[PDB]
Amino acid sequence: SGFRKMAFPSGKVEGCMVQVTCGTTTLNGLWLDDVVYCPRHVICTSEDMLNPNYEDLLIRKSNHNFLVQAGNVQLRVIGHSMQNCVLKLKVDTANPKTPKYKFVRIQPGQTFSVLACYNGSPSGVYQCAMRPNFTIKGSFLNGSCGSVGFNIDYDCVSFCYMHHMELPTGVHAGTDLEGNFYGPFVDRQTAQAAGTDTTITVNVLAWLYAAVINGDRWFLNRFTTTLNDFNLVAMKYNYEPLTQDHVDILGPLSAQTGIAVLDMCASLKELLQNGMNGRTILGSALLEDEFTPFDVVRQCSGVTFQ
Amino acid sequence: SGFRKMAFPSGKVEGCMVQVTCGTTTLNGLWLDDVVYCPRHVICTSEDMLNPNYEDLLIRKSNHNFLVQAGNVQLRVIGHSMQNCVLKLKVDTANPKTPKYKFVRIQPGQTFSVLACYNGSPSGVYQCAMRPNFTIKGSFLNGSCGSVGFNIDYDCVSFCYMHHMELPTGVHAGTDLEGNFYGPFVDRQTAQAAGTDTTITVNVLAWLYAAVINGDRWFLNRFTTTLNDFNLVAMKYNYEPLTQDHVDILGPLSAQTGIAVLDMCASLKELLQNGMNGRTILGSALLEDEFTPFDVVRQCSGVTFQ
Ligand SMILES: *[C@H](O)[C@H](C[C@@H]1CCNC1=O)NC(=O)[C@H](CC(C)C)NC(=O)OCc1ccccc1
Ligand SMILES: *[C@H](O)[C@H](C[C@@H]1CCNC1=O)NC(=O)[C@H](CC(C)C)NC(=O)OCc1ccccc1
């Protein structure tokens, strides 16, 4: 038993990270087959980042202006193109460590692992969730751009995130691997407000089920509720509304614990109105929403990968 | 900026995990050079685990009773010996993925990454601390034994933990890689009490420094204190006493933030006596003690590894 914020094993992604240098700027790239993907602001200087015209900046760059390094080996760039906010550098060498991979654009509330890198070398791995306002609460410093977020499905790595920027409020924004930003953000150094950050209700419920599986049952009450009555309370506390699809997704967790979803909603309603009164749940004094129902099943059943 | 519970990249350890089967029992082994390390209770049946005599049980086992599998490849066992609570199986093939490695026995308060495995395949990675009572608060199910804890120092993997058992209270116990248990535990299925779990004060202070580096300064007060006066308050709340060595270790964090260690101790003293009043620090409503001063420097400066 026990419950931890668990990241995916990073071995399959570590072998795909390279260092990309253009002039003075160095960030990380993702080397898959004979293509390196990296944020397009690698072609910017520090003054270009206030109001970059990426088309005009890219005209003055040739293949030989991009230095791609995989540890101590040099990759020769034989072609380059811009796809939305990412650059695709065609190199002369296919990555021999290329895993089975897929590009996926995730939905808010879904979780993934981030392999934080600097100069193309892994620094650490952690788990996070795409917030409802399309930000992530990450840990990134200068030089971390090009670090990727991923999920693993048995033997297939699903890349879903590439890091680009930090907002003035301390949260982080990036793109999918086709270069499309999550949310309304643009890759320029300007004031950009993020919307309201709401709590992922279906994830909180899955975490409460994980608590019951692990022996924390003090929050279970004798009340029940309805979907409409719960959502009326949930909206007041900036919680995401619960839908029938969410109830179906929680179905297997409800069957394993013998606690109906609406009964768990009533327990959550009491926690939202009266607080936790200094108590803790799974070692936390707040309601955690960065575990999906799948994350809970995966950790409480011991799913493994290639 | 930002701060996350960050684990080490697991790639170098994933290539060392194998599956070890003896009769009906299957757990994980660590394959380094031509030696596989695994918990010795792999030779037990379910009834042997109440009161195992490991010497008598091992007499009835030959080399060919141990089935070692690295994915789909079979390793031939050419020798076996018991070193404390671990078995060393000599195999005919040296692991070609053997990294630069070291065996280290860690001290309470130190942190490390756990690669949770089942059937020799990685399931996930998370960060934890050796508690002062020599337990860890992990996430382990049946079949997880032989999973290892590790640190990375540039290119060298330091193995410090191998998982063996879960206590009735839900916490976890294991050995170093020489088979010596952390704490007074023994590998038999019997009631074993753990001591009082105290809070690692030096780790809390490092985490408060990480909060200041990341813009959370509401808890900073105008008071200071002395080491003796702080420890008098710390002992009442089951906090580990702070020593002069701890002050020296926090030195670099104190110099980077311009906040003297004793001034931070006064802020902690106020948090212990008056609580946090519903506020949060780095997104937590409790005082976190699973970040060492080195972990904080490493994450806030972007240290990378091979
Ligand atoms: C890429 O490595 C870097 C990552 C940042 C550095 C601090 N933390 C991060 O996540 N990204 C940038 O420097 C990025 C580049 C633009 C061309 C998009 N800008 C950025 O994040 O600036 C921070 C900021 C911008 C505007 C107002 C306040 C802060
Ligand atoms: C090895 O895979 C396994 C790991 C356990 C299973 C549940 N969570 C874990 O961490 N270890 C054992 O089954 C271990 C074997 C003995 C020979 C040491 N026993 C164990 O942890 O039993 C749990 C327990 C023992 C006594 C009282 C209450 C619970």
XYZ file of C-alpha atoms and ligand atoms in Angstrom:
670
model
C 0.000 0.000 0.000
C 0.870 3.688 0.092
C 0.371 6.450 -2.453
C 2.991 8.708 -4.042
C 3.078 11.276 -6.831
C 4.641 8.826 -9.266
C 6.287 9.700 -12.579
C 6.811 7.393 -15.530
C 10.253 5.814 -15.983
C 12.238 8.221 -18.131
C 14.728 5.854 -19.788
C 13.061 5.838 -23.205
C 12.983 9.651 -23.351
C 16.489 10.291 -21.959
C 17.952 8.752 -25.117
C 16.075 11.248 -27.319
C 17.287 14.506 -25.737
C 19.871 16.567 -27.615
C 21.366 20.035 -27.311
C 20.420 22.619 -29.947
C 22.467 25.803 -30.317
C 21.753 28.698 -32.674
C 24.164 31.587 -32.266
C 24.127 32.456 -28.567
C 20.951 30.588 -27.551
C 21.081 26.973 -26.356
C 18.061 24.838 -25.471
C 16.964 21.204 -25.673
C 15.729 19.263 -28.669
C 13.849 16.007 -29.140
C 15.603 13.607 -31.534
C 13.197 11.089 -33.110
C 14.169 9.180 -36.276
C 16.139 11.756 -38.352
C 14.268 14.843 -37.076
C 15.072 17.136 -34.146
C 12.191 19.159 -32.669
C 12.876 22.285 -30.614
C 11.196 25.590 -29.696
C 11.476 28.134 -32.484
C 12.702 30.908 -30.183
C 16.125 29.233 -30.306
C 16.705 31.593 -33.260
C 16.064 34.672 -31.090
C 18.534 36.921 -29.358
C 17.653 38.419 -25.985
C 16.392 41.596 -27.674
C 14.377 39.727 -30.324
C 12.197 38.107 -27.647
C 10.147 41.242 -26.904
C 8.489 41.299 -30.354
C 9.911 38.561 -32.587
C 8.974 38.241 -36.247
C 9.895 34.577 -36.574
C 9.516 34.475 -40.368
C 11.955 37.368 -40.826
C 14.366 35.922 -38.253
C 14.363 32.478 -39.883
C 15.239 33.877 -43.337
C 18.704 34.804 -42.052
C 19.417 31.254 -40.803
C 20.886 28.407 -42.847
C 21.279 24.729 -41.993
C 24.845 25.293 -40.775
C 23.753 27.918 -38.228
C 22.121 25.162 -36.125
C 24.521 23.146 -33.953
C 22.933 19.900 -32.728
C 24.866 17.825 -30.196
C 23.932 14.456 -28.685
C 26.295 14.346 -25.723
C 29.657 14.508 -27.492
C 28.503 13.561 -31.014
C 27.679 16.155 -33.669
C 24.578 15.845 -35.848
C 24.663 17.455 -39.293
C 21.566 19.524 -40.110
C 20.486 18.918 -43.715
C 17.142 20.742 -43.629
C 15.001 22.973 -41.430
C 11.391 24.110 -41.352
C 9.033 25.911 -38.985
C 5.780 24.193 -37.980
C 3.787 26.609 -35.818
C 5.945 27.290 -32.738
C 8.447 24.439 -33.182
C 11.404 24.024 -35.504
C 11.968 20.699 -37.262
C 15.652 20.127 -38.018
C 16.354 17.247 -40.384
C 19.649 15.612 -39.412
C 21.829 13.128 -41.290
C 21.585 10.427 -38.587
C 18.470 8.597 -37.428
C 18.376 8.205 -33.659
C 19.256 4.539 -32.941
C 17.470 4.859 -29.577
C 14.187 5.997 -31.144
C 11.369 4.280 -29.210
C 7.878 3.522 -30.402
C 6.369 6.983 -30.144
C 3.234 8.988 -30.821
C 2.333 12.681 -30.732
C -0.817 13.437 -28.738
C -2.539 16.667 -27.740
C -3.932 16.188 -24.237
C -7.046 17.662 -22.613
C -7.120 19.696 -19.386
C -7.124 17.495 -16.315
C -4.867 14.856 -17.867
C -1.491 14.147 -16.268
C 1.970 13.452 -17.661
C 5.627 13.212 -16.667
C 8.107 16.014 -17.380
C 11.784 15.249 -17.984
C 13.481 18.530 -17.097
C 16.661 18.971 -19.143
C 19.475 21.505 -19.464
C 22.040 21.478 -22.296
C 20.438 18.273 -23.571
C 21.126 16.383 -20.339
C 18.388 15.104 -17.993
C 18.078 16.868 -14.646
C 15.013 15.240 -13.082
C 11.536 13.872 -13.664
C 8.238 14.870 -12.066
C 4.501 14.432 -12.575
C 2.069 17.251 -13.288
C -1.374 17.942 -14.707
C -2.537 20.195 -17.514
C -4.515 22.803 -15.585
C -7.998 23.825 -16.781
C -6.505 27.187 -17.825
C -3.965 25.317 -20.029
C -0.967 26.023 -17.788
C 1.191 23.629 -15.807
C 2.708 24.175 -12.371
C 6.224 23.062 -13.230
C 9.838 23.560 -12.204
C 11.804 25.204 -15.016
C 14.809 27.534 -15.176
C 16.674 29.259 -17.989
C 17.791 26.747 -20.595
C 14.990 24.266 -19.826
C 12.991 24.929 -23.006
C 12.609 21.906 -25.231
C 12.105 19.652 -22.217
C 9.168 17.381 -22.984
C 6.160 15.912 -21.217
C 5.165 12.337 -21.945
C 3.048 9.330 -21.044
C 3.908 5.660 -21.570
C 1.437 3.006 -22.760
C 3.224 -0.339 -22.295
C 5.886 0.129 -24.990
C 4.720 3.348 -26.704
C 5.846 6.808 -25.566
C 3.179 9.479 -26.116
C 4.773 12.928 -26.301
C 2.272 15.614 -25.342
C 4.169 18.720 -24.196
C 7.218 20.826 -25.025
C 8.216 23.644 -22.687
C 8.449 27.231 -24.005
C 7.867 29.872 -21.356
C 7.099 30.952 -17.804
C 4.305 33.407 -17.105
C 4.897 36.375 -14.766
C 2.713 34.577 -12.195
C 5.148 31.642 -11.940
C 3.253 29.055 -13.994
C 4.402 27.489 -17.244
C 3.127 27.231 -20.808
C 4.128 25.224 -23.838
C 3.021 23.461 -26.995
C 2.202 20.022 -28.260
C 4.751 18.385 -30.545
C 3.089 19.957 -33.605
C 3.952 23.398 -32.222
C 0.436 24.459 -31.209
C 0.331 26.184 -27.828
C -1.916 24.856 -25.117
C -4.098 27.844 -24.311
C -4.109 31.331 -25.812
C -0.421 31.993 -25.261
C 2.154 33.180 -27.795
C 5.933 32.796 -27.703
C 6.949 36.381 -27.053
C 8.191 38.026 -23.855
C 5.121 40.087 -23.042
C 2.557 40.300 -20.267
C 0.111 37.427 -20.774
C -2.621 36.736 -18.244
C -3.795 33.226 -17.466
C -7.436 32.565 -16.705
C -8.950 31.285 -13.490
C -7.303 28.077 -12.253
C -10.109 25.728 -11.234
C -9.850 22.413 -9.387
C -10.217 19.201 -11.407
C -13.148 17.642 -9.551
C -12.968 14.191 -11.157
C -9.303 13.960 -10.120
C -10.120 14.876 -6.509
C -12.704 12.084 -6.411
C -10.207 9.556 -7.770
C -7.732 10.640 -5.084
C -10.388 10.203 -2.382
C -10.963 6.681 -3.711
C -7.203 6.091 -3.486
C -7.395 7.251 0.134
C -10.135 4.721 0.929
C -8.158 1.938 -0.772
C -5.219 2.895 1.482
C -7.183 3.011 4.747
C -8.137 6.696 5.141
C -11.914 6.598 5.690
C -12.520 9.357 8.260
C -14.044 11.709 5.668
C -16.800 9.264 4.641
C -20.159 10.612 5.831
C -23.710 9.251 5.960
C -25.067 11.693 3.362
C -25.592 11.337 -0.358
C -26.348 13.967 -2.984
C -27.313 14.522 -6.607
C -25.138 15.601 -9.510
C -26.970 18.937 -9.774
C -26.814 19.637 -6.033
C -23.103 18.806 -5.864
C -22.227 20.967 -8.884
C -24.045 23.914 -7.302
C -21.668 23.656 -4.338
C -18.669 22.815 -6.537
C -19.073 25.939 -8.688
C -18.970 28.208 -5.628
C -15.499 26.871 -4.732
C -14.143 27.115 -8.316
C -14.433 23.360 -8.860
C -14.956 21.935 -12.326
C -18.514 20.648 -12.837
C -19.024 16.898 -12.699
C -20.733 15.212 -15.654
C -22.179 11.778 -16.329
C -19.057 10.851 -18.311
C -17.000 11.516 -15.170
C -19.280 9.176 -13.203
C -18.695 6.406 -15.750
C -14.927 6.957 -15.631
C -14.961 6.570 -11.839
C -17.068 3.403 -12.185
C -14.265 0.863 -11.667
C -13.020 2.696 -8.571
C -16.568 2.798 -7.199
C -16.968 -0.945 -7.792
C -13.638 -1.806 -6.147
C -14.406 0.150 -2.961
C -18.166 -0.422 -2.796
C -18.784 3.330 -2.430
C -21.151 4.941 -4.926
C -19.829 7.984 -6.774
C -22.638 10.207 -5.489
C -21.889 9.107 -1.925
C -18.268 10.171 -2.426
C -19.510 13.477 -3.870
C -21.431 14.065 -0.631
C -18.237 13.489 1.364
C -16.399 15.964 -0.871
C -19.229 18.483 -0.444
C -18.760 18.298 3.332
C -14.995 18.758 2.978
C -15.519 21.838 0.793
C -17.981 23.489 3.204
C -16.470 22.587 6.589
C -12.804 22.113 5.675
C -10.574 19.302 6.878
C -10.259 20.683 10.445
C -6.498 20.208 10.627
C -6.691 16.562 9.557
C -4.889 15.054 6.571
C -5.755 12.675 3.736
C -2.956 10.517 2.295
C -0.460 12.781 4.038
C -1.860 15.970 2.469
C -3.728 18.826 4.147
C -5.224 19.991 0.823
C -7.422 18.255 -1.724
C -5.125 16.916 -4.463
C -6.312 17.030 -8.077
C -3.222 15.898 -10.030
C -4.152 12.187 -10.071
C -6.492 10.977 -12.797
C -8.721 7.922 -12.242
C -6.308 6.012 -14.488
C -3.304 7.135 -12.417
C -5.018 5.743 -9.310
C -5.856 2.387 -10.912
C -2.353 2.186 -12.391
C -0.613 2.795 -9.059
C -2.992 0.685 -6.952
C -2.764 -2.278 -9.367
C 0.934 -2.187 -10.318
C 0.832 -1.610 -14.081
C 4.278 -1.932 -15.684
C 5.811 -0.822 -18.981
C 8.446 -1.975 -21.458
C 10.988 29.101 -11.152
C 8.651 26.660 -9.435
C 9.330 23.745 -7.111
C 8.350 20.093 -7.545
C 9.092 16.821 -5.778
C 11.627 15.786 -8.398
C 13.057 12.297 -8.878
C 16.310 11.393 -10.585
C 16.163 10.171 -14.195
C 15.774 6.408 -14.014
C 17.319 5.343 -17.334
C 20.565 4.017 -15.865
C 18.707 1.850 -13.331
C 15.970 0.557 -15.670
C 18.617 -1.398 -17.581
C 19.702 -3.221 -14.402
C 16.327 -4.640 -13.317
C 15.683 -8.351 -13.833
C 13.061 -10.861 -12.746
C 14.074 -13.501 -10.192
C 11.901 -16.579 -9.668
C 12.450 -19.334 -7.106
C 9.700 -21.934 -7.097
C 6.447 -20.006 -6.738
C 7.870 -16.648 -5.594
C 8.807 -13.940 -8.103
C 10.411 -10.601 -7.242
C 12.890 -8.142 -8.745
C 16.659 -8.356 -8.874
C 19.445 -5.870 -9.520
C 21.852 -7.006 -12.256
C 25.293 -5.368 -11.957
C 28.328 -6.866 -13.732
C 27.801 -10.669 -13.436
C 25.930 -10.575 -10.097
C 22.192 -10.373 -9.409
C 21.112 -9.029 -6.002
C 17.648 -9.793 -4.629
C 15.861 -10.150 -1.273
C 16.540 -13.510 0.332
C 12.867 -14.203 1.050
C 12.526 -15.148 -2.629
C 13.313 -18.671 -1.360
C 10.295 -18.638 0.983
C 6.851 -20.060 0.451
C 3.839 -18.248 1.879
C 3.941 -20.440 4.997
C 7.710 -20.061 5.486
C 7.358 -16.289 5.929
C 5.936 -16.472 9.469
C 9.165 -17.865 10.981
C 11.753 -18.536 8.269
C 15.063 -20.234 9.002
C 16.879 -18.898 5.954
C 19.963 -21.094 6.413
C 17.859 -24.272 6.457
C 15.736 -23.072 3.528
C 18.783 -22.215 1.406
C 20.340 -25.682 1.859
C 17.549 -27.182 -0.257
C 18.187 -24.780 -3.171
C 20.670 -25.293 -6.001
C 21.798 -22.908 -8.731
C 19.209 -24.304 -11.154
C 16.315 -23.539 -8.785
C 16.786 -19.797 -9.457
C 15.272 -18.533 -12.720
C 16.650 -15.110 -13.688
C 15.072 -13.336 -16.656
C 16.047 -10.001 -18.219
C 12.946 -9.265 -20.271
C 12.917 -12.260 -22.612
C 16.534 -13.407 -22.128
C 17.509 -16.129 -19.659
C 20.518 -15.741 -17.366
C 22.261 -18.905 -16.175
C 22.985 -18.956 -12.431
C 26.458 -20.385 -11.777
C 26.718 -19.587 -8.061
C 24.698 -18.280 -5.128
C 25.426 -16.967 -1.652
C 23.586 -15.200 1.157
C 24.970 -11.892 2.458
C 22.823 -10.789 5.400
C 19.297 -10.307 4.008
C 20.170 -10.325 0.290
C 21.019 -13.146 -2.082
C 23.883 -12.735 -4.551
C 23.345 -14.838 -7.675
C 26.385 -15.139 -9.924
C 25.240 -15.331 -13.546
C 27.134 -16.311 -16.693
C 26.588 -12.939 -18.421
C 27.861 -9.543 -17.308
C 25.236 -6.839 -17.725
C 26.275 -4.804 -20.808
C 24.233 -1.871 -19.453
C 26.087 -1.794 -16.123
C 26.597 1.886 -15.211
C 29.239 3.366 -12.972
C 27.807 2.404 -9.603
C 28.473 2.500 -5.881
C 26.815 0.982 -2.815
C 26.109 3.503 -0.054
C 24.318 3.260 3.281
C 22.439 6.521 3.812
C 21.625 8.386 7.032
C 18.133 9.383 8.202
C 16.954 12.591 6.591
C 18.652 11.867 3.265
C 16.514 11.525 0.140
C 16.610 9.194 -2.854
C 14.578 8.053 -5.852
C 12.701 4.738 -5.882
C 12.151 2.845 -9.135
C 9.106 0.711 -8.360
C 9.212 -2.524 -10.365
C 7.048 -5.612 -10.847
C 8.233 -8.772 -12.638
C 11.497 -6.980 -13.413
C 9.767 -4.203 -15.359
C 9.703 -0.543 -14.250
C 6.351 0.806 -13.082
C 7.190 4.326 -11.901
C 9.684 6.531 -10.106
C 9.210 8.740 -7.052
C 11.258 10.612 -4.462
C 11.255 9.864 -0.746
C 13.293 10.368 2.408
C 14.691 7.914 4.922
C 12.616 8.753 7.993
C 14.325 9.239 11.376
C 12.784 5.917 12.480
C 14.466 4.198 9.477
C 11.243 3.683 7.514
C 10.165 5.160 4.202
C 6.684 6.283 3.187
C 6.572 4.502 -0.152
C 4.145 2.994 -2.643
C 4.668 -0.766 -2.900
C 2.417 -3.736 -3.668
C 2.936 -7.487 -3.796
C 5.807 -8.366 -6.107
C 7.596 -5.024 -5.629
C 10.433 -6.400 -3.483
C 13.856 -5.963 -5.007
C 12.939 -2.500 -6.269
C 15.838 -0.198 -5.456
C 16.418 3.336 -4.229
C 19.227 5.368 -5.738
C 20.930 8.727 -6.128
C 22.924 9.971 -9.121
C 26.168 11.968 -8.884
C 26.883 13.186 -12.434
C 27.666 9.789 -13.988
C 27.729 7.509 -10.913
C 24.618 5.735 -9.604
C 24.659 5.298 -5.815
C 22.381 2.430 -4.786
C 21.202 2.872 -1.207
C 17.975 0.897 -0.713
C 16.332 -2.405 -1.619
C 12.695 -2.979 -0.702
C 11.727 -5.941 1.522
C 8.552 -5.387 3.507
C 5.579 -3.288 4.568
C 4.832 -2.732 8.236
C 1.270 -3.176 9.559
C 1.095 0.628 9.897
C 1.506 1.144 6.133
C 5.150 2.243 6.028
C 8.003 0.408 4.345
C 11.336 -1.085 5.370
C 14.309 -2.456 3.500
C 18.058 -2.939 3.399
C 21.137 -1.421 1.876
C 22.755 -3.327 -0.978
C 24.895 -5.306 1.494
C 21.709 -6.771 2.975
C 21.730 -4.861 6.272
C 18.295 -3.576 7.256
C 17.792 0.090 7.937
C 16.448 0.099 11.478
C 15.766 -2.800 13.835
C 13.586 -4.743 11.423
C 13.904 -8.390 10.390
C 12.586 -10.098 7.263
C 9.824 -12.198 8.768
C 6.053 -11.693 8.687
C 5.531 -10.701 12.304
C 4.293 -7.681 14.218
C 7.122 -5.134 14.252
C 6.608 -1.683 15.725
C 8.306 1.381 14.301
C 9.470 4.148 16.595
C 8.277 7.730 16.718
C 8.387 9.444 13.314
C 9.919 12.877 13.867
C 10.152 15.772 11.412
C 13.513 16.439 9.740
C 14.043 20.039 10.845
C 17.004 20.820 8.578
C 14.932 19.697 5.577
C 12.019 21.952 6.565
C 14.399 24.917 6.719
C 15.800 24.132 3.271
C 12.240 23.970 1.922
C 11.433 27.351 3.491
C 14.510 28.745 1.734
C 13.207 27.247 -1.520
C 9.920 29.045 -0.849
C 11.692 32.397 -0.451
C 13.686 31.804 -3.648
C 10.344 31.190 -5.405
C 8.553 34.266 -4.039
C 6.688 32.978 -0.956
C 7.770 35.368 1.818
C 4.602 35.817 3.902
C 5.924 33.637 6.743
C 9.043 35.773 7.322
C 8.719 37.556 10.674
C 10.696 40.255 12.486
C 11.912 37.933 15.258
C 15.129 36.001 15.659
C 16.036 33.242 18.098
C 18.870 31.098 19.417
C 19.678 27.483 18.641
C 18.833 26.424 22.207
C 15.561 28.372 22.308
C 14.446 26.997 18.938
C 15.273 23.387 19.857
C 13.222 23.730 23.046
C 10.192 24.542 20.887
C 11.156 22.015 18.200
C 11.309 19.104 20.661
C 7.753 19.771 21.858
C 6.442 19.271 18.299
C 8.519 16.109 17.649
C 11.013 17.990 15.476
C 14.596 16.814 15.168
C 17.023 19.062 17.074
C 19.080 21.497 15.028
C 22.865 21.417 15.422
C 25.733 23.643 14.344
C 26.529 21.239 11.494
C 23.003 21.822 10.164
C 23.609 25.586 10.263
C 26.773 25.169 8.186
C 24.949 22.965 5.670
C 22.282 25.649 5.209
C 25.013 28.285 4.785
C 24.876 28.558 0.979
C 21.084 28.891 1.025
C 21.347 31.581 3.704
C 23.913 33.483 1.624
C 21.837 33.277 -1.566
C 18.684 34.656 0.083
C 20.300 37.050 2.563
C 18.291 35.531 5.436
C 20.252 34.265 8.432
C 19.555 30.691 9.509
C 18.490 31.762 13.002
C 16.069 34.284 11.499
C 14.504 31.471 9.466
C 14.345 29.356 12.637
C 12.311 32.131 14.276
C 9.871 32.066 11.351
C 9.569 28.285 11.692
C 9.008 28.648 15.446
C 6.054 30.946 14.735
C 4.639 28.489 12.191
C 4.886 25.644 14.717
C 3.132 27.578 17.506
C 0.451 29.474 15.563
C -0.010 27.224 12.525
C -0.307 28.390 8.938
C -3.864 29.766 9.369
C -5.195 28.175 6.191
C -2.396 29.606 4.047
C -0.026 27.567 1.888
C 3.708 27.507 1.185
C 4.862 26.305 -2.248
C 1.393 24.868 -2.791
C 1.451 22.819 0.432
C -0.606 23.301 3.595
C 1.885 21.290 5.693
C 5.575 21.758 6.400
C 7.478 19.526 3.958
C 10.622 17.748 5.160
C 11.516 15.493 2.200
C 13.849 18.011 0.510
C 17.453 18.147 1.678
C 19.487 21.367 1.363
C 21.271 19.709 -1.567
C 17.956 18.851 -3.254
C 16.981 22.529 -3.044
C 20.279 23.793 -4.477
C 20.166 21.113 -7.178
C 16.646 22.017 -8.315
C 17.062 25.795 -8.001
C 20.365 25.758 -9.940
C 19.622 23.154 -12.634
C 22.220 20.454 -11.948
C 22.286 17.791 -14.677
C 23.624 14.241 -14.919
C 25.102 11.897 -17.515
C 13.404 28.600 -22.337
O 14.453 27.879 -21.731
C 12.905 29.665 -21.340
C 12.267 28.979 -20.115
C 11.854 29.947 -19.004
C 12.990 30.705 -18.292
C 12.470 30.907 -16.856
N 11.572 29.766 -16.691
C 11.127 29.243 -17.855
O 10.276 28.351 -17.966
N 11.937 30.557 -21.980
C 11.959 31.891 -22.199
O 12.916 32.571 -21.808
C 10.777 32.567 -22.931
C 11.195 32.900 -24.378
C 10.157 33.664 -25.229
C 10.760 33.950 -26.615
C 8.817 32.936 -25.389
N 10.296 33.687 -22.127
C 9.813 33.611 -20.863
O 9.363 32.615 -20.295
O 9.894 34.832 -20.267
C 9.407 34.900 -18.897
C 8.526 36.113 -18.790
C 8.002 36.716 -19.942
C 7.186 37.844 -19.841
C 6.888 38.380 -18.585
C 7.403 37.783 -17.433
C 8.220 36.656 -17.536
C 7.841 -8.219 -1.465
O 7.356 -7.978 -2.767
C 6.717 -7.904 -0.459
C 6.389 -6.397 -0.493
C 5.195 -5.998 0.377
C 3.821 -6.555 -0.041
C 2.823 -5.466 0.395
N 3.639 -4.255 0.331
C 4.969 -4.485 0.403
O 5.847 -3.616 0.480
N 7.107 -8.305 0.894
C 6.566 -9.198 1.753
O 5.544 -9.822 1.440
C 7.220 -9.425 3.134
C 7.986 -10.765 3.122
C 8.631 -11.195 4.458
C 9.303 -12.564 4.271
C 9.648 -10.191 5.017
N 6.207 -9.274 4.174
C 5.471 -8.162 4.414
O 5.733 -7.007 4.076
O 4.346 -8.496 5.104
C 3.456 -7.392 5.433
C 3.076 -7.533 6.880
C 3.837 -8.338 7.741
C 3.481 -8.470 9.084
C 2.360 -7.800 9.579
C 1.599 -6.994 8.729
C 1.955 -6.864 7.387
